[PDB]
From a paper:
Our structural analysis shows that ARS2 is made up of two regions, residues 147–270 and 408–763 that co-fold into a structured core with an intervening glutamate-rich region of unknown function that is likely unstructured. The human ARS2 core has an unusual structure comprising a largely helical ‘body’ from which project N- and C-terminal ‘legs’. We find that the RRM domain is required to bind RNA, whereas a basic patch in the C-terminal leg of ARS2 mediates the interaction with FLASH.
Based on the incomplete model, the N-terminal helix was truncated at position 171 with the aim of producing better crystals. ARS2171–270+408–763 crystallised in hexagonal space groups P6522 or P65, diffracting to 3.2 and 3.5 Å resolution, respectively. In mammals, loop A (538-ASEPGT543PPLPTSLPS-552) is highly conserved and proline-rich. In most crystal forms, the loop is disordered presumably due to flexibility. In all crystal structures of hARS2 (except that with loop B deleted), only the first part of the loop is observed with 570-AEEEELL forming helix α10 (‘EEEE helix’). To accommodate the same intermolecular contact in different crystal-packing environments, some angular flexibility of the loop B structure is required. Concerning loop B, in most ARS2 crystal forms the negatively charged ‘EEEE’ helix binds onto the positively charged RRM β-sheet surface of a neighbouring molecule. Repetition of this inter-molecular contact generates a three-dimensional network.
Author numbering:
A (entry chain A): 174 to 269
B (entry chain C): 411 to 537, 553 to 577, 599 to 703, 724 to 762
Amino acid sequence: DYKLDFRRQQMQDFFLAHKDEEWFRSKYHPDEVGKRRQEARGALQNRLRVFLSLMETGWFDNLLLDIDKADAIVKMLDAAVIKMEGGTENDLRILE
Amino acid sequence: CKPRPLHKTCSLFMRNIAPNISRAEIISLCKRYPGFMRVALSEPQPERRFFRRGWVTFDRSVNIKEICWNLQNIRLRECELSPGVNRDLTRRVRNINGITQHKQIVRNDIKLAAKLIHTLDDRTQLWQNPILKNITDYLIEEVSAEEEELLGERDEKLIKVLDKLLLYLRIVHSLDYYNTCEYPNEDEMPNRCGIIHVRGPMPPNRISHGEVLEWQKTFEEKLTPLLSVRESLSEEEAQKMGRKDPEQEVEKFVTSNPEFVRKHIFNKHAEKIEEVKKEVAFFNNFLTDAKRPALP
């Protein structure tokens, strides 16, 4: 059996060759995987807050995903990013 | 107080960045220019020996052309960055086929969107979701069959439901529905909410009988990759490749490093025994995964 032994070499060569690199550590290393998901869920919860903020404020109250309201969507998407960065209702005024 | 242009962000772009280079040194390189915000790296690609595409984002009140020139002939760990000024997105709101604003196909998309949100809320572990309350009411047909039996196109009520689901998918989970793709790193990259996809104007000819069903088969086929669980080898296949046992290789570390020597390592040096177990799991997670990074 060669193919079995061949895939062992390639795998183990790659684990050696990319052991200490950031991207590889982040995918598989227990410490870095855990600290990645905390950042992810922390940043995702920030995006959830923004969606719930845009709901009650009514930024997509009369807004359908259609090219007739293409300019209205862009105006909303800007307001989404402003709230992600953390701007108040004052900071949104430049869109008006 | 003056209002800020927080939606606008000018940024740099780097074509080839090495895999051994982390965010740390790229951030601290670009940190000392005022108005710096965040660095974003792409997923490395095996075709270029796992090289990453970078994106250094700056504030709008900054001259990016000077800062791009400043770092133009500057290397970092035997790798020339050579940035270029990443221009803004021109065409954001893009079209798709006009068939997707139909009664039956919107109902189909509400079912699939509801399925995606259930899955993504479990996967990410947020929260229950208020936009998924009484969605089952909108999935069922409601018709006057008896009044036809005895005697004998747009539906905005369904579309307004769909939009709240599709906007949630896009804004929260970075999932553009109609294009059928994720934008996973968006929250670090310069434009946080870039390209959204939108329904077409309208079909010129009649809406065909079987063509509506053929779209639903094709559209659901593209969405199924987005809810893909990460692969794993079988118990025998993983063991034959060489799954290292944690407690066994801890014993190999102790014997290499008689009875008084073993009681010293476990009790005093408690940090090392877990560090070996972590690097075993580091290797086993890479082994178990049946979709590894490797040279093509």
